[PDB]
Amino acid sequence: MEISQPSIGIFYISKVLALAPYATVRNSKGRVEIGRSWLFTVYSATLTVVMVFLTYRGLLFDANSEIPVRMKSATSKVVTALDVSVVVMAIVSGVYCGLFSLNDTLELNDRLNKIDNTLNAYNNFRRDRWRALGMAAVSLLAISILVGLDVGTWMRIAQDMNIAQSDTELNVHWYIPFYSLYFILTGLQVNIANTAYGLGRRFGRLNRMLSSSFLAAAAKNKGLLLKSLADSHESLGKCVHLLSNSFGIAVLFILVSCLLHLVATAYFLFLELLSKRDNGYLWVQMLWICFHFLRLLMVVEPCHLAARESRKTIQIVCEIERKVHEPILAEAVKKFWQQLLVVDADFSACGLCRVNRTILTSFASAIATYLVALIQFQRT
Amino acid sequence: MEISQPSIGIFYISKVLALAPYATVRNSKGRVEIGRSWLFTVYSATLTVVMVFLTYRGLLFDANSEIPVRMKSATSKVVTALDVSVVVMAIVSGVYCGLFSLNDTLELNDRLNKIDNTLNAYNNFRRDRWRALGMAAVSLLAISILVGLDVGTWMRIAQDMNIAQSDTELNVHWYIPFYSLYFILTGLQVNIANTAYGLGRRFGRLNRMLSSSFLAAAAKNKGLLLKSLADSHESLGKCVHLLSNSFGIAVLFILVSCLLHLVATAYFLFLELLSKRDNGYLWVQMLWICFHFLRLLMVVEPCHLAARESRKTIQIVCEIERKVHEPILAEAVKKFWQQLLVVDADFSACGLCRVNRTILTSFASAIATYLVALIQFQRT
Amino acid sequence: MEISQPSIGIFYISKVLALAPYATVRNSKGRVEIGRSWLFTVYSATLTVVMVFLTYRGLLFDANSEIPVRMKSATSKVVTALDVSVVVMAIVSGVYCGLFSLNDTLELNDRLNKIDNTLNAYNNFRRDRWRALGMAAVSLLAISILVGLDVGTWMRIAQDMNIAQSDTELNVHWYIPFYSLYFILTGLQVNIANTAYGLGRRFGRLNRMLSSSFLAAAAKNKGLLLKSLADSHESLGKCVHLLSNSFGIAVLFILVSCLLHLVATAYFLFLELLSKRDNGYLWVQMLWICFHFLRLLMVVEPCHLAARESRKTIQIVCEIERKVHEPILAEAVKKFWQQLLVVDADFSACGLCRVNRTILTSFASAIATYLVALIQFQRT
Amino acid sequence: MEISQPSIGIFYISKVLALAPYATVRNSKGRVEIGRSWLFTVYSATLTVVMVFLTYRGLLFDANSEIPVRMKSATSKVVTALDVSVVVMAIVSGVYCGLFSLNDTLELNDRLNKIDNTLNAYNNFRRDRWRALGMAAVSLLAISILVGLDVGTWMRIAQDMNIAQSDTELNVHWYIPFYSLYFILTGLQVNIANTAYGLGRRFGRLNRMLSSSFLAAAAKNKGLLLKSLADSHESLGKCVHLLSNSFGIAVLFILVSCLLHLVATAYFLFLELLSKRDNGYLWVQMLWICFHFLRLLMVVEPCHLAARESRKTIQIVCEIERKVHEPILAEAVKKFWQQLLVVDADFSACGLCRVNRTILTSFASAIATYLVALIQFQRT
Ligand SMILES: OC[C@H]1O[C@](O)(CO)[C@@H](O)[C@@H]1O
Ligand SMILES: OC[C@H]1O[C@](O)(CO)[C@@H](O)[C@@H]1O
Ligand SMILES: OC[C@H]1O[C@](O)(CO)[C@@H](O)[C@@H]1O
Ligand SMILES: OC[C@H]1O[C@](O)(CO)[C@@H](O)[C@@H]1O
Ligand code: NA
Ligand code: NA
């Protein structure tokens, strides 16, 4: 996990959302020292357990109510239970990762500090801060608007089925913990995306420095710079591996949640399109599909960019080899090429899959198969 | 994108079809300088938007007509809408790529110029021009004949359902913009295929030169030639990567269109084969299947050939190593082997997939699954 | 197969379970010499044949009984027959592997002896013995408890269908050989897991020694130590390949059994959840799903860990290269890097698949497809 | 294609079966010179066309007969047509490959001659001849017995439906060309398997020679021997690539035929098992499944063995590196390691897939999916 001053707002958002139980103090040097915060550790654990319990309690209440609003049919019951469970598992994995990833966070931030010192020429505090805040604000505003639309639509739908001998609005009110879990999931995804995008951006800055200092006494300093760049590349690879070892289960459950959410939301949209009982419901389902696809991209594109930027450095190094003649600098470039030949760049989600754009294709296939089975199941 | 004098006809076809909004002037040296053409840029954008709007307007008109011709049943409505949407998305991606790929086009053509200068011994202006013109003419004639057959069949079918209180021929007439989109798609595919086939052909020429100059004072010139060949190979790899970064979204949507078109056309053929209402319709569907498969090959085989030709150069270089003894030439061959060891040759469609013949297999599986679900859906 | 003093209990369990027909004598040096035991060879073969015959005889008896308990419906008959056949094939493959893998076992144990001598600094006899005994005891206790629950549930179910003109409890009693096959399968899986986990643990110890002796006269001894570590790594790779060549068919049938068992047990759970005839049956099916998933992990995680630990040594060697300066030691490290560049670490199940965590994903897809077809089949 | 004296019987079988239209003359040196045989070329082409026409004519006759025997139901018609078409396409691809693969055959046999001269120490004329003749005889006897059983079963079935106003035995008699196509397919598969197994066996002999001459004045001769072994390895790789470029389409259609045949035969077996009209039909379907699986293995295992034997030579070369000290011999071993690092060993079926054991897994998945759809289709 990355905890830097430009992106400290994302850190605070994740902290209040039970995902970053760390206490950070900014040094007089501008560095952010990180340690365990037991108060926020127990707060995160308790909030996660309480909200999961409340979410499932509301689910059971809807299922056991006189007029269920969402959990009415066996198919609807199963789909809604799966939708709630994927969110619960994703947020629980994120909280667990944030609880037991302090050492990885410290190592990653130290490595990023040395890399930024090496790449001080391309650091943009203002631009990085604004990109981080914009991503966080856009994600939170999108989820807030979407939750408002969903709750309003479901309140209208529940009032449409309201019978004088029962209240169906409390059923919708009991689904608020699920939306809180959605907010926690959005914060976790924003944090992971910020970290992965920072890693990829640093890879790109390293490649730009390589191309600008080697393709655009003194040779000794140039070789020292190349050694520093190679060390930064190795440290960025290790930072990617740390992010993986820390949040791979979280990323895996996020991907599972995206897949199941897309399938379930498309199934609900198809049902409403056949029945055409409501149009606002249809548009809310389209917005949910867009949100799920956008967050799938949010979790996929960062790792793909990081791997792509790290795997394009070997070509630059080959160019330097072909253009370099100095003995010590040529030897340093040879060492760098050897180091890059065996670089493991792709992000691994607990070893189950390598997170890149190819996943999307696979996802589509699954979303093409299951959803179509599900549709066939409706007919049958 | 490749814009050369031998294939200038393909460039003009793509330009009038809203895909190559560039102004080209032939120098006294025979070189083709390329720049942005704002007139044709706005013409391409406006034509794309207008024809997409007209296509979807005709779709809605057919769906909302008294006697729909094509959009009659929910299954038929969905299938026809998907068929039209894949074409719309493919042509829109191609137009967008041609609009925002001027720098990549310039770089690719400069690189191809230097490569052709290096490979002047195997350049065949007449043969290249005739192959390009033959490909373009065959593609355009095939799509024209197929559109004529389809429109005649659909006119007959609409007249068969004609009731005195309505005209069903205007429904077919309103599907002409869709056929125009098909022409644009054919032009885009022809252009992409010409570029990729040129890259693969240059790879093959480079390999032939390697084998004829190294396996079939003076050693200094031979090493200079080997250095030029290595530079040409690296430039061809970068040209492949430029073509990818420029038209990968277009290739991806072309592949999606081919898959969905094959599935939908096979479904329609199976329906007509059960009902046997018309035989000309069945033969037109078979011709459509052939056309879609042929254009899938048109987009797949070029990249496969390019990768295959680029990946077989390392074996030739190993042979030279095993046969070369001169110091400087041996060092140059070692440098070339090192360069080839880390060559990224496969064509990437926006990172979603690597375009090669393996895709075909996968496609078949999908075409075996979805189509079979679709058939089962008819029964259900 | 690994036969060591710490894990000799697992060896005895596999021996009485017809999986390790070897006679072992402990030398005065603490080494375990292994040879063929013809008495136990014929005992294993005869027990396997007899128990397979009894299992299938009980299956036929249930199918041909007046009131079948498990083999009642065509779907139930097929599912139960597949469930029994996967277990039979898995245990038969394990027994055959143990019968015809004496040379591989001897080679593997010799190699492990030399490796342990090399890694004597990290050997923990007590911890290894306790981990092995704990794994064996947990597996055997889990399968025993699960068999008891299953047999009690099926006895209750059979008594519920009991008619005065027939006894349905003998039908359940005739399924005891199948549970014995389950015990044999558990023992085989425990043995394979112990061997693979030992290989991975030795890889980890080798990497720890590398990092502690090279990143934490004399240089000659250090280079000798590095040569010994490289030899140990190569021997561990060859031990992995021996385990593969010996028990790959067994691992493949174990994976097939896990897949089919998960599908069938989930199908039975879904049936009981629709009918809700019994709740103990549902909980027993959940326990069976947990057991099958846990043993799938038991067979998958060891190979994944071994490959992961073997593939992370090249980065350590690159670090030594970047930090080493001595001539002979630098040459030894270069030799080690060259050796690691071409290391085949992944475990192969008879060439059909590479056993790692990715399999899980694929399995899920299959378990998502077949089971869903099976559910659709119930409706149809 | 391999045409050697030990396997000349397989060559004659393929020649009379329209697959090897070559004239071979044995020199006084024992070498077999190969050339085009126009008589047998036209005989092969004419026989292929005539038998395909007769097969499809019998298919149409059965479909258009008063009482169809095999082509009765739409599902049965489609399945039988696909079964016949896969065989037709496989044999046509094999015949076309044999017609237009004379240059590849000559190159492959020259390379095999030089390799055998290099590996004269491990050549076993008697064993190779007997293995080739045994494979051919077993394949031909199996297909003959299976065709006899199938034709007898279908004659009985046709006589069971015989009505006094028509003859249903001529319908079975008109399916004899299909069995002739099966014989041609068996011969083609036997030839391809013999060639691929010879390549893999030569790879194994090369590895054995490496291990026996380097791990079990004079050093100059040893380095000469190593150079010859490296040349033999490169020639064997090129022979594999020649076999691919010559018969990849044939292998691809053989694999497609195996897949479709397994699916169709299992579907027919399931139908007969539900109806239980005949038991001999069921056993014949089981025998057909066994035959199709065995020929799938016949086409898969050879390439897998070749790749496995070629990919295990680099480890032996690393061992020699680690054990070799002589300057010239060490340099030769380094050259060999460099050559092996970039070896393309896997067999490619026209670029669609790499033929190895992994295919089997994929096949199973397909055979698990389609067949299950097909079963569901019966219910629907
Ligand atoms: O299921 C349709 C949509 O409704 C939600 O459950 C929100 O309450 C989402 O998980 C899903 O996208
Ligand atoms: O759908 C069947 C065929 O008809 C078309 O729509 C042409 O109008 C094609 O897209 C398709 O191949
Ligand atoms: O089929 C449901 C369960 O019952 C068993 O057959 C045990 O008798 C298991 O193989 C399976 O997990
Ligand atoms: O279809 C069942 C079997 O019958 C055959 O057609 C033989 O006539 C085979 O192709 C198939 O294995
Ligand atoms: Na179905
Ligand atoms: Na599928």
mmCIF file of all heavy atoms in Angstrom, chain C residues 50 81 146 156 193 233 236 250 278 290 344:
data_model
loop_
_atom_site.group_PDB
_atom_site.id
_atom_site.type_symbol
_atom_site.label_atom_id
_atom_site.label_comp_id
_atom_site.label_asym_id
_atom_site.label_seq_id
_atom_site.Cartn_x
_atom_site.Cartn_y
_atom_site.Cartn_z
ATOM 1 N N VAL C 50 -9.566 -56.424 -4.630
ATOM 2 C CA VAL C 50 -10.680 -56.926 -3.833
ATOM 3 C C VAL C 50 -11.619 -55.790 -3.460
ATOM 4 O O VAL C 50 -12.844 -55.924 -3.551
ATOM 5 C CB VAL C 50 -10.154 -57.654 -2.584
ATOM 6 C CG1 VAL C 50 -11.259 -57.821 -1.556
ATOM 7 C CG2 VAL C 50 -9.567 -59.000 -2.964
ATOM 8 N N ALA C 81 -22.397 -43.537 -9.786
ATOM 9 C CA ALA C 81 -21.424 -44.372 -10.475
ATOM 10 C C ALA C 81 -20.168 -43.584 -10.814
ATOM 11 O O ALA C 81 -19.054 -44.088 -10.651
ATOM 12 C CB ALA C 81 -22.045 -44.964 -11.739
ATOM 13 N N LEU C 146 -16.155 -37.690 8.489
ATOM 14 C CA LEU C 146 -17.035 -37.475 7.350
ATOM 15 C C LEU C 146 -17.700 -38.773 6.913
ATOM 16 O O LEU C 146 -18.889 -38.780 6.581
ATOM 17 C CB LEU C 146 -16.233 -36.857 6.207
ATOM 18 C CG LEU C 146 -16.980 -36.092 5.121
ATOM 19 C CD1 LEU C 146 -17.881 -35.028 5.717
ATOM 20 C CD2 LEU C 146 -15.969 -35.466 4.186
ATOM 21 N N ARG C 156 -30.090 -43.491 8.258
ATOM 22 C CA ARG C 156 -31.371 -42.869 8.574
ATOM 23 C C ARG C 156 -32.248 -42.764 7.331
ATOM 24 O O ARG C 156 -33.445 -43.074 7.375
ATOM 25 C CB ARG C 156 -31.147 -41.489 9.189
ATOM 26 C CG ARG C 156 -30.529 -41.526 10.572
ATOM 27 C CD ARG C 156 -30.517 -40.158 11.249
ATOM 28 N NE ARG C 156 -29.964 -39.106 10.403
ATOM 29 C CZ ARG C 156 -30.664 -38.367 9.551
ATOM 30 N NH1 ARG C 156 -31.971 -38.517 9.411
ATOM 31 N NH2 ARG C 156 -30.036 -37.448 8.824
ATOM 32 N N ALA C 193 1.269 -35.058 -0.894
ATOM 33 C CA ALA C 193 1.396 -33.717 -0.343
ATOM 34 C C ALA C 193 2.635 -33.597 0.528
ATOM 35 O O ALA C 193 3.328 -32.579 0.484
ATOM 36 C CB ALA C 193 0.145 -33.362 0.455
ATOM 37 N N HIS C 233 19.899 -27.216 -5.852
ATOM 38 C CA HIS C 233 18.769 -26.719 -6.633
ATOM 39 C C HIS C 233 18.480 -27.626 -7.823
ATOM 40 O O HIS C 233 17.318 -27.956 -8.099
ATOM 41 C CB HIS C 233 19.051 -25.293 -7.103
ATOM 42 C CG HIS C 233 17.844 -24.572 -7.613
ATOM 43 N ND1 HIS C 233 17.336 -24.773 -8.878
ATOM 44 C CD2 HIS C 233 17.051 -23.640 -7.034
ATOM 45 C CE1 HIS C 233 16.278 -24.002 -9.053
ATOM 46 N NE2 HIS C 233 16.084 -23.305 -7.950
ATOM 47 N N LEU C 236 16.901 -30.759 -6.562
ATOM 48 C CA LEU C 236 15.510 -30.553 -6.177
ATOM 49 C C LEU C 236 14.608 -30.487 -7.402
ATOM 50 O O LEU C 236 13.489 -31.015 -7.388
ATOM 51 C CB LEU C 236 15.384 -29.280 -5.346
ATOM 52 C CG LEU C 236 15.726 -29.426 -3.867
ATOM 53 C CD1 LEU C 236 15.980 -28.070 -3.240
ATOM 54 C CD2 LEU C 236 14.615 -30.152 -3.136
ATOM 55 N N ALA C 250 -1.548 -40.340 -10.955
ATOM 56 C CA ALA C 250 -2.284 -40.295 -9.697
ATOM 57 C C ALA C 250 -2.798 -38.891 -9.409
ATOM 58 O O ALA C 250 -3.952 -38.718 -9.005
ATOM 59 C CB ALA C 250 -1.396 -40.779 -8.555
ATOM 60 N N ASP C 278 -34.124 -33.593 4.297
ATOM 61 C CA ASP C 278 -33.257 -33.741 5.460
ATOM 62 C C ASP C 278 -32.291 -32.567 5.529
ATOM 63 O O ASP C 278 -31.886 -32.030 4.495
ATOM 64 C CB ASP C 278 -32.481 -35.061 5.399
ATOM 65 C CG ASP C 278 -31.757 -35.376 6.694
ATOM 66 O OD1 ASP C 278 -31.609 -34.464 7.535
ATOM 67 O OD2 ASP C 278 -31.337 -36.537 6.872
ATOM 68 N N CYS C 290 -16.359 -29.090 1.452
ATOM 69 C CA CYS C 290 -15.177 -28.565 2.126
ATOM 70 C C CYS C 290 -14.015 -29.544 2.040
ATOM 71 O O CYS C 290 -12.877 -29.145 1.781
ATOM 72 C CB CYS C 290 -15.505 -28.248 3.586
ATOM 73 S SG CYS C 290 -16.579 -26.813 3.811
ATOM 74 N N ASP C 344 13.134 -26.064 -15.358
ATOM 75 C CA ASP C 344 11.733 -26.460 -15.496
ATOM 76 C C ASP C 344 11.225 -26.840 -14.110
ATOM 77 O O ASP C 344 11.532 -27.917 -13.593
ATOM 78 C CB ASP C 344 11.590 -27.608 -16.488
ATOM 79 C CG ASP C 344 10.143 -27.967 -16.761
ATOM 80 O OD1 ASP C 344 9.260 -27.136 -16.463
ATOM 81 O OD2 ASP C 344 9.888 -29.081 -17.264
#
